[PDB]
RNA sequence: AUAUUAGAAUGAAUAUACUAAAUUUGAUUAGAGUACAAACAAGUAUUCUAAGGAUAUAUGUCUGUCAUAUUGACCCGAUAUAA
RNA sequence: UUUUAACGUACCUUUUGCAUAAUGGGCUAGCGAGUUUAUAUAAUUAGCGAGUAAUUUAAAUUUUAUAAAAUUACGAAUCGAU
RNA sequence: UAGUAAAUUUCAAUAAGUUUUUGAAAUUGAAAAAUAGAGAUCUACCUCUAAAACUUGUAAAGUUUAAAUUCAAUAGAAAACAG
């Protein structure tokens, strides 16, 4: 839905329904269409949501099933898939945060002496005249490495539609699964490891978990070299690509799809639209607040007199009360529209 | 370049001297090779009908016509034969030559002498 | 000013019949290809309501009918079909993007009115030769996109 | 997110010039004021556009002139070329093509309506 | 050459599979990136003995080339045509804005008809982004008016402010320098009312032929 | 003359903008070849209005 | 067409005639569109002496010309399909008929045979 | 078709050319455009529209001389001036 | 692998043109020549579209997504020595 | 911060090859905020300013360490103990 990107996004709410009983299904359209119409065709339906269930996160394949279910969003995991967007995001991540100081030595920065090592005539062999040069001993090259750089820049607006395409395949492909919450009774890896081992030995994960964190968890989930944890705030398209699987926190969803729907309002915004502080940024002055100056302000005391520090305000409030006298004070004063 | 080094060495076994090793006379020594042999495979489909015709304008001639008069009358004659196998034939096959010879004779209104 | 001597009788020789073409059978296949005669939709149309006010045409109509392919309007209220030239206007060709489903569908129904045109598809849009934007709008809001 | 950026990317000063815009009695009087050394641009040929004007929207670009033989000797001419002389002169295909190339910036009406 | 074929419609862009979304498994549409065949590197490729430069002359030489001024020591199309006169005085101009634009706006619902039309209202609307020295209301789209509007503005033209009073309406020129416009259009960082010029010569010589105009003008008066 | 038959209307507009024009040139020109006196007719130089005639 | 040049010369090697206009340098412009007709006459000793006339007829419109077809649909726009064009049938190329290659020589199979298998 | 037609040569004209005479300054101003020729730039012939004149049945003719050569770019500078 | 038969005057450079008695190479392995940056114009594949286009984040100090930000630059209007 | 400000001829650096300004060489040398100077030569009007000092640590080659970008013995450095 490109169209309705220019109003602004209310504040998320997650319609969940409690299913109880079997894991529903979600199909996705047949291969063939998605092969020759891959940028005009979704990977799932449109009109008819995604009933999606919310798995445990420590537990088994057939044994771990809550009872409820989720219905996400269309514009952000069924968009049609195209490589064309992504491969020219990876490129430019690959080439921004790049420079190169290499470099080789011409005719010029290679020692040297710069004569001749012999006079062209009555030597009965080649014209040598300068020293170093290519071809030459110790020669370096004419058009070697140079020292560069190699950010450039590309439209912001496909910076971001190649995530959302991404986390349109995980769901497609097969792959990201949802979480309810990540929490954990200890610090200790021991809990983590046990129940993940059986669960999925062979996967690097990826886990995107919301601002307010269990401390149990940011202990344990590290030494686990699958394993790989990213805030909403912060989830780049190689992240999904470097990893196979995803799990996502049924709360931290919420904060996933009011950035992704407010970032593209950031950018899709017709002029006349107002904009304010969003429940993205709102949010993030909950937990992590910036500090703001004092309130400590002054109240003027008609009934006792005033008395400045500074020897200018004195004299500045002395030759004041002096032309309420005379009169002359309305001279001073101005009427500008 | 283009042809390999492992490639010239077998295209020039057999040569001689220098022309067999080394390169700045084997590639052009190879080369004239090929543009020989494109030349002389050409070559090989006319020599062959220079040999055709002369084993048969000498085994007709034992039958007193020549070679001229001889196929003259092949083609007003009803016979597809080629000169290939009337080579063939008055070598080896010589009877079935002289029974071919016979009806061309006669289908023109040919008479020997 | 009026013109005079060549530069007027040219000006004149539009009210006058035209000597025929001689033109390279290319041509030729184009408009066979181009006066084809047409052919029945099989997607109908739903007609505009008269005196509508400018505020309104600016605004969708609905649709009725269950369509396989579905074209979305921009991030303001418009329809996106565009105009697209060369640096020296040469090259005229219509635009148009935001499509879905099946576009073999949106092509045979699309080179009707246009009259049978060539269409250049491309990833993520469809390039038409020959300026007919005012057509097409005339046939999406008629469906009601 | 450049983890270490050098000194020679930054920006690059002139060499035969001073290390200030300004100076004192100790200061010196051969050397100027400082400078940037930017990367070079191809700038429009100042003679062109004084022998020329713009004409015509951006995609069909032309070039207005005025014809010569005109200011020196006029008694020796005719009335017609004379009057051939005040009229419109736009450039040819042929020389227009070798002189784009000396004027980068044409199709920018800001260019444009100051000449 | 530059000049490169268009990929037809019967060239395939996928790959007959289904492919995941890996760092391995992508590419992008054909006709991206054209590969020009490396110079001096073969007698096949086309560009071996020489890189197209040609037998030896001047331009096949390191650093060959003649300038586009050059023409064989023939005086050249600069230096033989004359001089013209002088460019522009008046480099500080308005934009021209047409009506088929704030026209446009206005069957949105981005402006309100009920109330003066300024120079901010339009900025904000979406109609321009930059003017520096004022607007004018040069009339192309004339006929869509429907309604009466009230302008507020640095200049404008004849048939406009004819066109407009045949509806009703009005039209109000405005002398302001860029001071004084970028006041108007971003007054957050002028929090300092600013008091008005009084202007020299040039400007009433435009501003009288404002008002012959049959418009309605603004400025302070020299005596 | 006229070109009944269709056409690209959006095209070939400027088509349409050079018809219309060279139909009221025609009727500008047969107006006064009605409407002109006889004064107008003439060219310049026998417009004019001479007091004393020739001799 | 109307001032258009027919003739350079150097005096009148070829005369003007009517509907012509001559000049300084004994050009020959014409006067209105039309035909050029060259006319000769003989005087009393055996002189060839040539005009140049032109017959003031119109000329063929080979430089405004409409502009090519186009077929509205009607349901679409009904009152522009009224006026389309009907069809063209324009021969654009001959349909080639291609060479029957003989096939006796290629032999036939034989099912159901006698061998020597080994 | 010679005589000639301002001067070289060719071409052409014979209502040319030569000669006598009466009135006179079109050897004027402005604007639009085609064609020949033509790498470019340059050069050439002239119709149409407007003002303001001459000639004098004008009904009309004239925007230097029968034609072709009879010269020089741009810059800088200069006198008079419709801005 | 030898003999016989027929055919057959090298290579690169330069040139109107060379087996050329015109230049150059004793053979072999390895080094050995359109590369880098920036601006403008065009074309091609894409993004959004009467609007489009952000990172001196070259930072923050555990250390990030290039998270904002359209001032500004181009833009659907040209004519005239001015 | 009175032999100062400023001025005449010349030059320098000021985008300017010329007509300023800022400074220097030579020659002359003021007033007292009511005064003085700049504003591309001169005049008038007006506006702005007040011709004293001090103040931004890491610049540079060389050694060593850690990290990024690179070569892997005809490369990398002239030098895998080599000035
Ligand atoms: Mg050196
Ligand atoms: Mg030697
Ligand atoms: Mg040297
Ligand atoms: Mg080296
Ligand atoms: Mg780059
Ligand atoms: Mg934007
Ligand atoms: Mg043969
Ligand atoms: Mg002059
Ligand atoms: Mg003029
Ligand atoms: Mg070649
Ligand atoms: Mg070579
Ligand atoms: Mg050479
Ligand atoms: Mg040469
Ligand atoms: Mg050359
Ligand atoms: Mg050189
Ligand atoms: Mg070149
Ligand atoms: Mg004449
Ligand atoms: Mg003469
Ligand atoms: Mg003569
Ligand atoms: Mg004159
Ligand atoms: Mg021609
Ligand atoms: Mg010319
Ligand atoms: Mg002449
Ligand atoms: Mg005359
Ligand atoms: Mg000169
Ligand atoms: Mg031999
Ligand atoms: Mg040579
Ligand atoms: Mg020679
Ligand atoms: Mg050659
Ligand atoms: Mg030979
Ligand atoms: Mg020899
Ligand atoms: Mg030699
Ligand atoms: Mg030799
Ligand atoms: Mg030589
Ligand atoms: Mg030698
Ligand atoms: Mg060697
Ligand atoms: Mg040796
Ligand atoms: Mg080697
Ligand atoms: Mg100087
Ligand atoms: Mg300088
Ligand atoms: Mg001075
Ligand atoms: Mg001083
Ligand atoms: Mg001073
Ligand atoms: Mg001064
Ligand atoms: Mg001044
Ligand atoms: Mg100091
Ligand atoms: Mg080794
Ligand atoms: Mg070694
Ligand atoms: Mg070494």
Redesign the interface.
């Given at each position: 839905s490109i169209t309705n990107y220019s109003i602004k996004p209310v504040k998320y709410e997650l319609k969940i329904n409690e299913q109880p009983g079997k894991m529903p299904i979600l199909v996705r359209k047949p291969d063939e269409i998605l092969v020759k119409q891959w940028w005009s065709q979704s990977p799932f339906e449109k009109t008819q949501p995604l009933r999606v269930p919310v798995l445990k996160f420590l537990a088994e394949n057939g044994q771990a099933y809550t009872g409820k279910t989720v219905d996400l969003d269309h514009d952000i995991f069924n968009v049609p898939l195209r490589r064309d967007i992504v491969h020219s995001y990876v490129l430019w991540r690959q080439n921004r945060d790049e420079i190169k100081t290499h470099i080789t030595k011409t005719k010029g920065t290679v020692s040297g002496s710069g004569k001749k090592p012999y006079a062209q005539k009555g030597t009965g062999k080649a014209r040598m005249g300068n020293k170093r040069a290519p071809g030459r001993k110790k020669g370096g090259k004419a058009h070697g490495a140079k020292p560069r750089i190699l950010r450039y820049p590309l439209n912001k607006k496909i910076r971001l539609q190649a995530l959302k395409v991404v986390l349109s395949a995980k769901l497609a492909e097969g792959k990201l699964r949802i979480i309810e919450t990540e929490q954990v009774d200890e610090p200790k890896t021991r809990a983590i490891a046990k129940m993940l081992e059986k669960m999925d030995k062979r996967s690097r994960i990826l886990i995107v978990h919301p601002y307010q964190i269990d401390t149990n968890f940011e202990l344990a989930h590290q030494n686990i070299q699958k394993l790989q944890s990213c805030y909403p705030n912060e989830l780049s398209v190689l992240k999904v690509l470097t990893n196979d699987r995803v799990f996502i926190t049924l709360e931290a969803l919420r904060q996933l799809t009011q950035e992704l729907q407010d970032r593209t309002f950031r950018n899709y915004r017709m002029k006349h639209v107002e904009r304010g502080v969003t429940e993205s940024e709102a949010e993030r002055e909950q937990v992590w607040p910036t500090p703001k100056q004092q309130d400590t302000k002054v109240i003027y005391d008609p009934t006792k007199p005033l008395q400045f520090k500074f020897k200018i305000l004195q004299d500045y409030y002395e030759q004041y009360e002096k032309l309420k006298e005379n009169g002359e004070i309305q001279k001073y004063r101005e009427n500008i529209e | 370049t283009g042809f390999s080094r492992e490639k010239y060495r077998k295209l020039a076994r057999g040569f001689f001297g220098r022309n067999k090793n080394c390169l700045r006379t084997m590639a052009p020594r190879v080369d004239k090779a090929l543009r020989y042999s494109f030349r002389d495979r050409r070559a090989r489909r006319r020599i062959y009908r220079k040999e055709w015709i002369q084993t048969i304008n000498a085994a007709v001639r034992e039958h007193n016509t020549p070679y001229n008069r001889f196929i003259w009358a092949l083609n007003q004659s009803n016979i597809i034969l080629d000169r290939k196998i009337l080579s063939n034939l008055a070598i080896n096959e010589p009877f079935s030559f002289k029974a071919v010879l016979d009806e061309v004779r006669i289908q023109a209104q040919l008479q020997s002498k | 000013m009026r013109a005079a001597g060549k530069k007027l009788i040219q000006q004149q020789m539009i009210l006058r019949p035209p000597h025929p073409r001689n033109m390279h059978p290319v041509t030729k296949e184009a408009q066979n290809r181009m006066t084809q005669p047409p052919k029945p939709l099989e997607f109908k149309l739903q007609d505009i309501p008269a005196n509508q006010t400018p505020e309104q045409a600016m605004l969708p109509l609905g649709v009725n009918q269950i369509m396989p392919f579905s074209i979305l309007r921009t991030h303001t209220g418009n329809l996106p079909v565009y105009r697209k030239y060369n640096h020296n206007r040469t090259s005229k060709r219509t635009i148009i993007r935001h499509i879905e489903g099946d576009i073999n569908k949106f092509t045979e129904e699309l080179s009707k009115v246009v009259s049978n045109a060539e269409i250049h598809v491309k990833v993520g849009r469809v390039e038409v030769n020959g300026l007919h934007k005012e057509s097409i709008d005339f046939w999406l809001k008629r469906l009601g996109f | 997110?450049?983890?270490?950026?050098?000194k020679?990317?930054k920006t690059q000063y002139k060499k035969g010039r001073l290390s200030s815009r300004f100076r004192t009695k100790s200061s010196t009087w051969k050397r100027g004021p400082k400078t940037v050394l930017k990367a070079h641009k191809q700038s429009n040929?100042s003679?062109?556009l004084?022998?020329?004007?713009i004409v015509g929207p951006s995609?069909?670009r032309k070039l207005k002139?005025?014809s010569?033989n005109?200011?020196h000797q006029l008694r020796k001419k005719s009335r017609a070329c004379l009057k051939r002389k005040r009229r419109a002169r736009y450039a040819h295909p042929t020389?227009f093509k070798?002189?784009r190339?000396?004027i980068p910036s044409l199709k920018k009406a800001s260019f444009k309506?100051?000449? | 050459s530059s000049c490169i074929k268009q990929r037809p419609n019967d060239v395939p862009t996928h790959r007959n599979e289904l492919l995941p979304f890996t760092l391995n498994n992508l590419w992008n549409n054909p006709g991206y990136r054209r590969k020009a065949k490396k110079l001096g590197r073969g007698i096949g490729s086309g560009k071996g003995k020489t890189a197209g430069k040609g037998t030896n002359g001047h331009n096949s030489r390191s650093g060959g080339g003649v300038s586009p001024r050059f023409e064989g020591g023939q005086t050249p199309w600069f230096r033989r045509l004359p001089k013209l006169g002088i460019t522009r005085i008046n480099k500080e101009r308005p934009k021209a804005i047409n009506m088929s634009l704030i026209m446009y706006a206005i069957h949105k619902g981005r402006i309100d008809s009920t109330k003066p039309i300024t120079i901010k209202v339009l900025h904000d609307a979406g109609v321009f982004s930059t003017a520096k020295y004022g607007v004018k209301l040069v009339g192309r789209g004339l006929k869509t008016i429907d309604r009466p509007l009230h302008f507020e503005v640095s200049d404008a033209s004849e048939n406009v402010i004819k066109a407009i009073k045949e509806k009703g309406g009005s039209v109000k020129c405005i002398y302001r320098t860029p001071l004084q416009i970028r006041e108007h259009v971003f007054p957050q960082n002028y929090p300092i009312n600013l008091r008005s010029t009084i202007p020299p010569k040039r400007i009433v010589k435009k501003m009288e032929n404002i008002r012959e105009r049959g418009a309605e003008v603004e400025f302070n008066v020299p005596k | 003359y006229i070109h009944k038959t269709s056409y690209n209307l959006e095209q070939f507009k400027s088509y349409t903008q050079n018809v219309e024009k060279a139909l009221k040139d025609l009727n500008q020109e047969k107006e006064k070849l009605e409407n002109s006196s006889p004064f107008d007719l003439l060219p310049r130089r026998k417009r004019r209005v001479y007091d004393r005639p020739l001799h | 067409f109307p001032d258009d040049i027919l003739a350079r010369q150097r005096g009148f090697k070829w005369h003007a005639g009517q509907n012509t206009y001559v000049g300084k340098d004994h050009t020959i412009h014409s006067k209105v569109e039309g035909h050029v007709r060259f006319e000769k006459k003989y005087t009393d000793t055996n002189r060839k002496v040539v005009t140049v006339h032109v017959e003031p007829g119109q000329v063929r419109n080979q430089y405004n010309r409409p502009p090519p077809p186009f077929v509205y649909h009607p349901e679409l726009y009904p009152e522009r399909a009224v006026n389309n064009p009907a069809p063209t049938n324009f021969q654009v190329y001959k349909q080639t008929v291609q060479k029957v290659k003989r096939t006796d020589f290629r032999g036939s199979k034989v099912e159901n045979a006698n061998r020597n298998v080994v």
């Open positions: - | - | - | 997110a450049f983890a270490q950026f050098p020679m990317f040929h003679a062109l004084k022998r020329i004007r995609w069909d002139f005025k010569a005109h200011r020389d070798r002189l190339r000396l309506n100051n000449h | - | - | -």
